UniProtKB/Swiss-Prot annotation:
Residues with Phosphoserine modification: 4, 57, 64, 272, 418, 488
Protein name, UniProt field: Albumin
Gene name tied to this protein: ALB
Family that this chain belongs to: Belongs to the ALB/AFP/VDB family.
Entry comment describing in which tissues the protein is expressed: Plasma.
Annotated site residues (Not glycated) in this chain: 3, 19, 40, 63, 72, 92, 105, 135, 158, 173, 180, 189, 194, 204, 211, 239, 261, 273, 285, 358, 371, 388, 401, 413, 431, 435, 465, 474, 499, 518, 523, 537, 540, 556, 559, 563, 573
Processing after translation: Glycated in diabetic patients. Phosphorylated by FAM20C in the extracellular medium.
Subcellular location: Secreted
Organism per entry: Homo sapiens
InterPro entries: ALB/AFP/VDB (IPR000264), Serum_albumin-like (IPR020858), Serum_albumin/AFP/Afamin (IPR021177), Serum_albumin_CS (IPR020857), Serum_albumin_N (IPR014760)
Subunit structure: Interacts with FCGRT; this interaction regulates ALB homeostasis. Interacts with TASOR. In plasma, occurs in a covalently-linked complex with chromophore-bound alpha-1-microglobulin with molar ratio 1:2 and 1:1; this interaction does not prevent fatty acid binding to ALB.
Phosphothreonine PTM sites in chain numbering: 82, 419, 421
Consequence of substituting residue 371 to E: In Naskapi/Mersin/Komagome-1
Record lineage: Eukaryota, Metazoa, Chordata, Craniata, Vertebrata
Effect of mutating residue 268 to G: In Nagasaki-1
């Protein structure tokens, strides 16, 4: 507690960081207000912040930040004209005014797609008015993502700024800058997805489920920490995410800072990997800690047999505290297996738990549960075999042809899915192969889990809204621990009725060779989906004949002069012989 809280935040973050976070905070609430407006409110709270720094006993400096924030929100003159119900929050008072404001945040504002400008425009606006360009751009992101944790948006923003500084003075501005922006775009979207997955888990599956996840990951993170230390970090982390899911930025930020400060005070009890994280400023501490790599596990850990199979007090220790015993099992297993995904560890714990629920009520428990560790081999191998098979495929073919292999397989399993959705799922899954199959076997499964979890929640909320399959709803509503296996065991839909032929879908023009490699790829892949949707009985060799003839057709009908006529002349020739090769 401090005499002036807005003073302590200004001194702590610094001016630049303050201005950026104030702009993000208000943009997330006044999503429909113009950029000029937010500039004027930021300058006004920034000047007020400084008077409180100069003298903490100055007027209004003693008020709380939630109160300061709501006060400024309520001095907006148009606020009833454009926000309406939000205006009535101003007639309440603290703390109900604050929670009223949170209720009236609109996750899905009806704002046009933020169009990427031309690289030379952006670089020129960059060079000529760095501030306005960066902040206008930052305002336009924050207003469209109002629930994206504000200091993480600033961490993403500062990387965008580094990409412009490096790339605007480069030889090929475009070749330097588009991969980086695309790189950042996906990452910010993966962060958004991870945040909502965690909240959604907390609300549907409960605290206990969430807690078992955190025990696994935390024990992988800090394998030399003691169970009691990890369990405290589990209880603190749950409180943090419970608060952060609720939406109040300042309360979520204090919970994260408090937890990071606790970790930094107890590095010896936690991990030897946090020294440099722990001398970063408050702004970066919890972010840095959250990204630090696992610590080394202790050298000669014993096997788990002693405590969890061979010991005689198994049923006694379990029954006196089922959750604490299971979490101790989870902690010992997860600290030993940084190569496993969290979900596969949770499967193991769920198998152990099911085993003791029936063994510990039986004639003699120990024979009943003597070989439950055997039941871990199949659960371990299924994911590791999936990674093996698919990383071999990615090297045999390439990203594009691995994406095309997945396109055919997933289109055959669930052909009711939109062609555009099928295209982007299979393409984003080729990119996960590219980044994870490049790790050794010992880090592939954690990497996959991290990215597949983004693709599956993304695909799921598209399903919740415009669903298309009952089997997908089953996969999207089941336990988060089982959601990837459920999708993996989706069988090829043999109930599917083929799609009628449409001659346009498989007719191609000269724009195909006047297109970007991406746009050409998306076009060819869109048609590969439609070929499977019209002929789902086609084999991979029957499809390769059609695909090999297509590629030669476009390499022949774009090296000629009357390319436009070849596309219809020889396009009618390839279509016909394709429909004779199939069906
Ligand atoms: C009247 C001003 C209100 C606006 C202030 C909003 C942002 C203040 C601080 C934001 C987060 C800073 C601390 C981050 C903590 C963490 O994530 O570890
Ligand atoms: C915003 C993404 C992660 C949220 C981080 C919450 C507070 C971080 C403080 C230290 C946490 C260390 C790692 C926690 C995440 C994990 O590995 O399960
Ligand atoms: C039934 C699926 C739910 C999600 C996965 C559950 C696996 C069972 C393991 C429960 C561990 C108990 C929570 C530990 C918290 C603590 O240490 O206090
Ligand atoms: C509206 C979109 C929802 C339906 C989309 C379902 C498409 C299935 C693709 C899921 C990918 C599964 C990831 C791993 C599965 C496997 O190993 O085969
Ligand atoms: C070299 C790029 C990889 C392969 C590109 C895949 C293109 C698949 C679409 C070709 C369909 C041609 C025949 C039409 C279908 C029909 O008539 O039944
Ligand atoms: N509204 C409050 O009670 C409050 C407390 N601490 C910081 C900010 N706001
Ligand atoms: N010119 C603009 O208003 C603008 C905004 N955001 C990005 C790019 N340009
Ligand atoms: Cl622009
Ligand atoms: Cl611009
Ligand atoms: Ru602009
Ligand atoms: Ru899995």
């Amino acid at each position: 507690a401090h005499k002036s809280e807005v003073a302590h935040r200004f001194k702590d973050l610094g001016e630049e960081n303050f201005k950026a976070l104030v702009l993000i905070a208000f943009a997330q609430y006044l999503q429909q207000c113009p950029f000029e407006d937010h500039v004027k409110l930021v300058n006004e709270v920034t000047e007020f912040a400084k008077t409180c720094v100069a003298d903490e006993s100055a007027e209004n400096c003693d008020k709380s930040l939630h109160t300061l924030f709501g006060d400024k929100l309520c001095t907006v003159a148009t606020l009833r004209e454009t926000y309406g119900e939000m205006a009535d929050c101003c007639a309440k008072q603290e703390p109900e005014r604050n929670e009223c404001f949170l209720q009236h945040k609109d996750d899905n504002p009806n704002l046009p797609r933020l169009v990427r400008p031309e690289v030379d425009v952006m670089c020129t606006a960059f060079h000529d008015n760095e501030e306005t360009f960066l902040k206008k751009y930052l305002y336009e992101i924050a207003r469209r993502h109002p629930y994206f944790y504000a200091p993480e948006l600033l961490f993403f923003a500062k990387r965008y700024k580094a990409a412009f500084t490096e790339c605007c003075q480069a030889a090929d501005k475009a070749a330097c800058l588009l991969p980086k922006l695309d790189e950042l775009r996906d990452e910010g979207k993966a962060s958004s997805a991870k945040q909502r997955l965690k909240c959604a888990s907390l609300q549907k599956f409960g605290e206990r489920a969430f807690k078992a996840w955190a025990v696994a990951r935390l024990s992988q993170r800090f394998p030399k920490a003691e169970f009691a230390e990890v369990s405290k970090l589990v209880t603190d982390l749950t409180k943090v995410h419970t608060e952060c899911c609720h939406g109040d930025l300042l309360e979520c930020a204090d919970d994260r800072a408090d937890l990071a400060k606790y970790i930094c005070e107890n590095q010896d009890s936690i991990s030897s990997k946090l020294k440099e994280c722990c001398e970063k400023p408050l702004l970066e501490k919890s972010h840095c800690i959250a990204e630090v790599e696992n610590d080394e596990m202790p050298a000669d850990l014993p096997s788990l047999a002693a405590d969890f199979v061979e010991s005689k007090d198994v049923c006694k220790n379990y029954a006196e505290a089922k959750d604490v015993f299971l979490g101790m099992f989870l902690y010992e297993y997860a600290r030993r297996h940084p190569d496993y995904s969290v979900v596969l560890l949770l499967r193991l714990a769920k198998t152990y738990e099911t085993t003791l629920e029936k063994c510990c009520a039986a004639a003699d428990p120990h024979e009943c549960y003597a070989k439950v560790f055997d039941e871990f081999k199949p659960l371990v191998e299924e994911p590791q075999n999936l990674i093996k098979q698919n990383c071999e495929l990615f090297e045999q073919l390439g990203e594009y042809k691995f994406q095309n292999a997945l396109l055919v397989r997933y289109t055959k399993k669930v052909p009711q899915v939109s062609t555009p959705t099928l295209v982007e799922v299979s393409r984003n899954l080729g990119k996960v192969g590219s980044k994870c199959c490049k790790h050794p076997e010992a880090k592939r499964m954690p990497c996959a889990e991290d990215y597949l979890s983004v693709v599956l929640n993304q695909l799921c909320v598209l399903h919740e809204k415009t669903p298309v399959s009952d089997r997908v709803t089953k996969c999207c509503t089941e336990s988060l621990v089982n959601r990837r296996p459920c999708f993996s065991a989706l069988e090829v839909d043999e109930t599917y009725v083929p799609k009628e032929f449409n001659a346009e879908t498989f007719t191609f023009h000269a724009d195909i060779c006047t297109l970007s490699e991406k746009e050409r790829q998306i076009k060819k892949q869109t048609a590969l989906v439609e070929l499977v949707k019209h002929k789902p009985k086609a084999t991979k060799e029957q499809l390769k004949a059609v695909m090999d003839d297509f590629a030669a057709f476009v390499e022949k009908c774009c090296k000629a002069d009357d390319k436009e006529t070849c596309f219809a002349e020889e396009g009618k020739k390839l279509v016909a012989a394709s429909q004779a090769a199939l069906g």
